[PDB]
Amino acid sequence: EKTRAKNFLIQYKSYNAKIDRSNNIRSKIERQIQAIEEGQLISQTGSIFEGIRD
Amino acid sequence: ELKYIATEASPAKVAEIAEDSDVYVSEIEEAADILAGDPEIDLGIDVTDELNQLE
């Protein structure tokens, strides 16, 4: 039933793109958490240097 | 009593209510086939040859 066979193959690789869609969205958000971790400490560093100045 | 049966088995009304049913029947059944219209999308968006290697 090679028609149906390649159709299962069509539906088979139909998921793989969707898994990759997830993985890249995960990686993108992990990177954007880190920018709030690193960014948040930089912000406070700026305020004590303001305390030194005044 | 034959008069009272013939008032309400009137062939003027038998033929009306029989024609009305048939129109609604073809209305509903064709409204089931457009309810299965999506095969035209499935057969279109996926045409993937590459799996002949996978075969």
Side-chain angles (χ1 to χ4, degrees):
Chain A
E1 294 175 18
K2 297 189 181 182
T3 304
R4 297 172 183 159
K6 199 169 184 181
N7 295 350
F8 286 125
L9 294 181
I10 287 162
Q11 182 65 260
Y12 152 69
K13 298 183 71 68
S14 295
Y15 279 125
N16 289 4
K18 295 180 182 297
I19 290 178
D20 292 344
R21 149 154 272 116
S22 176
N23 279 349
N24 301 346
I25 289 170
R26 177 177 172 209
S27 304
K28 181 164 177 175
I29 190 158
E30 284 182 4
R31 290 174 182 166
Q32 290 194 245
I33 290 159
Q34 179 174 340
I36 290 190
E37 291 183 355
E38 295 194 320
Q40 182 65 260
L41 83 87
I42 285 141
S43 177
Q44 286 205 340
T45 301
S47 185
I48 68 186
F49 280 54
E50 176 171 331
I52 284 183
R53 187 203 84 145
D54 282 17
Chain B
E1 286 300 332
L2 279 170
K3 181 162 46 150
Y4 186 87
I5 295 174
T7 293
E8 303 196 20
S10 280
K13 289 184 181 184
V14 170
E16 173 186 315
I17 282 155
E19 103 193 305
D20 259 306
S21 265
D22 284 28
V23 183
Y24 297 145
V25 156
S26 178
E27 185 178 2
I28 288 160
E29 183 280 335
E30 188 279 338
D33 199 35
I34 185 59
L35 195 136
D38 182 65
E40 193 63 17
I41 294 94
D42 311 315
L43 295 170
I45 186 167
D46 296 337
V47 295
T48 321
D49 286 332
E50 184 65 13
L51 319 98
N52 184 239
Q53 170 53 40
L54 182 52
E55 296 178 319

CSV table of all heavy atoms in Angstrom, one decimal, chain B residues 18-41:
chain,number,residue,atom,x,y,z
B,18,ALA,N,-44.4,15.6,1.3
B,18,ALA,CA,-43.4,14.7,0.7
B,18,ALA,C,-42.4,15.4,-0.1
B,18,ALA,O,-41.2,15.0,-0.1
B,18,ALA,CB,-44.1,13.6,-0.2
B,19,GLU,N,-42.8,16.5,-0.8
B,19,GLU,CA,-41.8,17.2,-1.6
B,19,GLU,C,-40.9,18.0,-0.6
B,19,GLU,O,-39.6,18.1,-0.8
B,19,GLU,CB,-42.4,18.2,-2.6
B,19,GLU,CG,-42.5,19.7,-2.1
B,19,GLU,CD,-43.4,20.5,-2.9
B,19,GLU,OE1,-43.2,20.6,-4.2
B,19,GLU,OE2,-44.3,21.2,-2.3
B,20,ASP,N,-41.4,18.5,0.5
B,20,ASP,CA,-40.6,19.3,1.4
B,20,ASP,C,-39.5,18.5,2.0
B,20,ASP,O,-38.4,19.0,2.2
B,20,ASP,CB,-41.5,19.9,2.5
B,20,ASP,CG,-41.8,21.3,2.3
B,20,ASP,OD1,-40.9,22.1,2.1
B,20,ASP,OD2,-43.0,21.7,2.3
B,21,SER,N,-39.8,17.2,2.4
B,21,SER,CA,-38.8,16.4,3.0
B,21,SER,C,-37.6,16.1,2.1
B,21,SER,O,-36.5,16.2,2.6
B,21,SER,CB,-39.5,15.1,3.5
B,21,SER,OG,-39.9,15.1,4.8
B,22,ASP,N,-37.9,15.9,0.8
B,22,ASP,CA,-36.8,15.6,-0.1
B,22,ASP,C,-35.8,16.7,-0.3
B,22,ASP,O,-34.6,16.5,-0.4
B,22,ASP,CB,-37.4,15.1,-1.5
B,22,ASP,CG,-37.9,13.8,-1.4
B,22,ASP,OD1,-38.4,13.3,-0.3
B,22,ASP,OD2,-37.9,13.1,-2.5
B,23,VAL,N,-36.3,18.0,-0.3
B,23,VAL,CA,-35.4,19.1,-0.4
B,23,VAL,C,-34.5,19.2,0.8
B,23,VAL,O,-33.3,19.4,0.7
B,23,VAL,CB,-36.2,20.4,-0.6
B,23,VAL,CG1,-35.3,21.6,-0.7
B,23,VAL,CG2,-37.1,20.3,-1.8
B,24,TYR,N,-35.1,19.1,2.0
B,24,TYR,CA,-34.3,19.1,3.2
B,24,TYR,C,-33.3,18.0,3.3
B,24,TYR,O,-32.2,18.1,3.8
B,24,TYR,CB,-35.2,19.1,4.4
B,24,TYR,CG,-36.1,20.2,4.5
B,24,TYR,CD1,-37.4,20.1,5.0
B,24,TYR,CD2,-35.7,21.5,4.1
B,24,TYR,CE1,-38.2,21.2,5.1
B,24,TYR,CE2,-36.6,22.6,4.2
B,24,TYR,CZ,-37.8,22.4,4.7
B,24,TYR,OH,-38.7,23.5,4.8
B,25,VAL,N,-33.7,16.8,2.7
B,25,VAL,CA,-32.7,15.7,2.7
B,25,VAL,C,-31.5,16.0,1.8
B,25,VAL,O,-30.4,15.7,2.2
B,25,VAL,CB,-33.4,14.4,2.2
B,25,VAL,CG1,-32.4,13.4,1.6
B,25,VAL,CG2,-34.1,13.7,3.4
B,26,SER,N,-31.7,16.5,0.6
B,26,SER,CA,-30.5,16.8,-0.1
B,26,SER,C,-29.8,18.0,0.4
B,26,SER,O,-28.6,18.2,0.1
B,26,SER,CB,-30.9,17.0,-1.6
B,26,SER,OG,-29.7,17.4,-2.3
B,27,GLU,N,-30.4,18.9,1.2
B,27,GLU,CA,-29.8,20.0,1.7
B,27,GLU,C,-28.8,19.5,2.8
B,27,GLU,O,-27.6,20.0,2.9
B,27,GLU,CB,-30.8,21.0,2.3
B,27,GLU,CG,-30.1,22.2,2.9
B,27,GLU,CD,-31.2,23.2,3.4
B,27,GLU,OE1,-32.4,22.8,3.4
B,27,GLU,OE2,-30.8,24.3,3.8
B,28,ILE,N,-29.2,18.6,3.6
B,28,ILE,CA,-28.4,18.1,4.7
B,28,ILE,C,-27.3,17.2,4.3
B,28,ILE,O,-26.2,17.3,4.8
B,28,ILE,CB,-29.4,17.3,5.7
B,28,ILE,CG1,-30.2,18.3,6.5
B,28,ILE,CG2,-28.6,16.5,6.7
B,28,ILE,CD1,-31.4,17.7,7.1
B,29,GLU,N,-27.6,16.3,3.3
B,29,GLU,CA,-26.5,15.4,2.9
B,29,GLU,C,-25.4,16.1,2.2
B,29,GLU,O,-24.2,15.7,2.4
B,29,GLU,CB,-27.1,14.3,2.0
B,29,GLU,CG,-26.1,13.2,1.5
B,29,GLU,CD,-25.3,13.6,0.4
B,29,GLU,OE1,-25.7,14.5,-0.4
B,29,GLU,OE2,-24.2,13.1,0.2
B,30,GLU,N,-25.7,17.1,1.4
B,30,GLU,CA,-24.6,17.8,0.7
B,30,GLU,C,-23.9,18.7,1.8
B,30,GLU,O,-22.7,18.9,1.7
B,30,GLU,CB,-25.1,18.7,-0.4
B,30,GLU,CG,-24.1,19.4,-1.2
B,30,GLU,CD,-23.5,20.6,-0.5
B,30,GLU,OE1,-24.2,21.2,0.4
B,30,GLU,OE2,-22.4,21.0,-0.8
B,31,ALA,N,-24.6,19.2,2.7
B,31,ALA,CA,-24.0,19.9,3.9
B,31,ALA,C,-23.2,18.9,4.8
B,31,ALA,O,-22.6,19.4,5.7
B,31,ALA,CB,-25.1,20.5,4.7
B,32,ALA,N,-23.3,17.6,4.6
B,32,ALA,CA,-22.3,16.7,5.1
B,32,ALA,C,-21.0,16.6,4.3
B,32,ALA,O,-20.0,16.4,4.9
B,32,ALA,CB,-22.9,15.3,5.4
B,33,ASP,N,-21.1,16.7,3.0
B,33,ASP,CA,-19.9,16.5,2.2
B,33,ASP,C,-19.0,17.8,2.2
B,33,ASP,O,-17.8,17.6,2.2
B,33,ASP,CB,-20.3,16.3,0.7
B,33,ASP,CG,-19.2,15.7,-0.1
B,33,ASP,OD1,-18.4,14.9,0.5
B,33,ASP,OD2,-19.1,16.0,-1.3
B,34,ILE,N,-19.6,19.0,2.3
B,34,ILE,CA,-18.8,20.1,2.6
B,34,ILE,C,-18.3,20.1,4.0
B,34,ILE,O,-17.3,20.8,4.3
B,34,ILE,CB,-19.6,21.4,2.3
B,34,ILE,CG1,-18.7,22.6,2.4
B,34,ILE,CG2,-20.7,21.5,3.2
B,34,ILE,CD1,-17.5,22.6,1.5
B,35,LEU,N,-18.9,19.4,4.9
B,35,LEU,CA,-18.4,19.1,6.2
B,35,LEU,C,-17.2,18.2,6.2
B,35,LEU,O,-16.4,18.1,7.2
B,35,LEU,CB,-19.4,18.6,7.1
B,35,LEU,CG,-19.2,18.6,8.6
B,35,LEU,CD1,-20.4,19.1,9.4
B,35,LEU,CD2,-18.9,17.2,9.1
B,36,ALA,N,-16.9,17.5,5.1
B,36,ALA,CA,-15.7,16.7,4.9
B,36,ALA,C,-14.8,17.3,3.7
B,36,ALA,O,-14.3,16.6,2.9
B,36,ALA,CB,-16.0,15.3,4.6
B,37,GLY,N,-14.8,18.7,3.6
B,37,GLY,CA,-14.0,19.3,2.6
B,37,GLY,C,-12.5,19.4,2.7
B,37,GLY,O,-11.9,19.6,1.6
B,38,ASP,N,-12.0,19.2,3.9
B,38,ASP,CA,-10.5,19.3,4.1
B,38,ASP,C,-9.6,18.3,3.4
B,38,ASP,O,-8.4,18.7,3.3
B,38,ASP,CB,-10.3,19.2,5.7
B,38,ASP,CG,-8.8,19.4,6.0
B,38,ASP,OD1,-8.3,20.4,5.8
B,38,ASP,OD2,-8.3,18.4,6.6
B,39,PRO,N,-10.0,17.2,3.0
B,39,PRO,CA,-9.1,16.3,2.1
B,39,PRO,C,-8.4,17.1,1.0
B,39,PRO,O,-7.2,16.8,0.7
B,39,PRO,CB,-10.0,15.2,1.6
B,39,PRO,CG,-11.0,15.1,2.6
B,39,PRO,CD,-11.3,16.5,3.0
B,40,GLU,N,-9.0,18.1,0.5
B,40,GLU,CA,-8.4,18.9,-0.6
B,40,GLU,C,-7.3,19.7,0.0
B,40,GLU,O,-6.3,20.1,-0.8
B,40,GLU,CB,-9.5,19.8,-1.2
B,40,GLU,CG,-9.1,20.5,-2.5
B,40,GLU,CD,-8.8,19.5,-3.6
B,40,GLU,OE1,-9.2,18.3,-3.5
B,40,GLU,OE2,-8.1,19.9,-4.6
B,41,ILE,N,-7.2,20.1,1.2
B,41,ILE,CA,-6.1,20.7,1.8
B,41,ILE,C,-5.0,19.7,2.1
B,41,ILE,O,-3.8,20.0,1.8
B,41,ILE,CB,-6.4,21.5,3.1
B,41,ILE,CG1,-7.4,22.7,2.7
B,41,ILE,CG2,-5.2,22.0,3.8
B,41,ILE,CD1,-8.8,22.3,2.9
